[PDB]
Amino acid sequence: HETSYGEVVDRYWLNQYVLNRENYDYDTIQLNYDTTALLSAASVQQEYYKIYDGENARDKVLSNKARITVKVRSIQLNGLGQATVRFTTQQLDSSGATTGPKQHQIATIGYTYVGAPMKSSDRLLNPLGFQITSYRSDPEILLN
Amino acid sequence: SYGEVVDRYWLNQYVLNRENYDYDTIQLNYDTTALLSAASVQQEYYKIYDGENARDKVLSNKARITVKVRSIQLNGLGQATVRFTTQQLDSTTGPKQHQIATIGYTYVGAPMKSSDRLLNPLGFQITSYRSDPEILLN
Ligand SMILES: [Ca+2]
């Protein structure tokens, strides 16, 4: 069965998801990738994996030479399993210097909770069975 | 308590944040550890990052400490023990340290500060924490 938890709890999990999915740090890839995968429904997993597959795979392209830091600015909920997360990302080089402008992004998210996973390791990191059922991140175009 | 599955989630995140060391994530680990800690526990934690032997001063970004949690027992009544290892790394330059964290915890409700509420929605609070070497005898 699916469960609701209210806005304080949703914001917690939505924030953790965006922070894990949009971050890039060679030293925490395992954790970020694993967490993102565990918190994502099957179709969403496959979309996320594409970022780390093939010849433009993020981990192969950036390797240990750069980071992408994420700042979450705001989180809106519609109370029916839908949310918007406004965030920025900033790429840094191997010396911690900024390369490129801040990117203003908006994540449009569908989510639910499905109950605690059966696997121990999974249950330890996702006790409520939070699941992102849709996710896309798009540039916020600042008009004017 | 919110029951076994929720308590273990929070105990595990607490140990992972407190016992980890990575220059690049100090702000997040330290803020998180502090915010999940009752006042007396915070002061105990802060000691690790103060004085001539402060962890961040001594390790800087020359070394990291990686933490693996092996088990968590809940001894009802707001007590728990977490069996874990730590190990110092280069960019495994040291022996594994087998430790046991003895823990008291509770929940005090959503914090008022928004940045705090975002990271500790139930107001999980560690009320006592000691990490001690597990002496493997025999
Ligand atoms: Ca690092």
Side-chain angles (χ1 to χ4, degrees), chain A residues 39-54 57-59 61-70:
Chain A
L39 299 186
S40 300
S43 69
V44 171
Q45 292 179 341
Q46 294 302 132
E47 290 158 358
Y48 172 68
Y49 298 159
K50 278 145 67 174
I51 296 171
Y52 292 85
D53 288 334
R58 179 165 276 179
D59 58 339
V61 175
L62 301 188
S63 173
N64 62 338
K65 312 174 272 172
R67 275 126 59 64
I68 297 170
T69 64
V70 183

Side-chain angles (χ1 to χ4, degrees), chain A residues 25-28 67, chain B residues 21-25 61 63-64:
Chain A
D25 186 336
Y26 184 71
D27 283 359
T28 67
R67 275 126 59 64
Chain B
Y21 180 79
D22 183 343
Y23 178 82
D24 302 303
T25 70
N61 200 18
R64 289 184 275 162

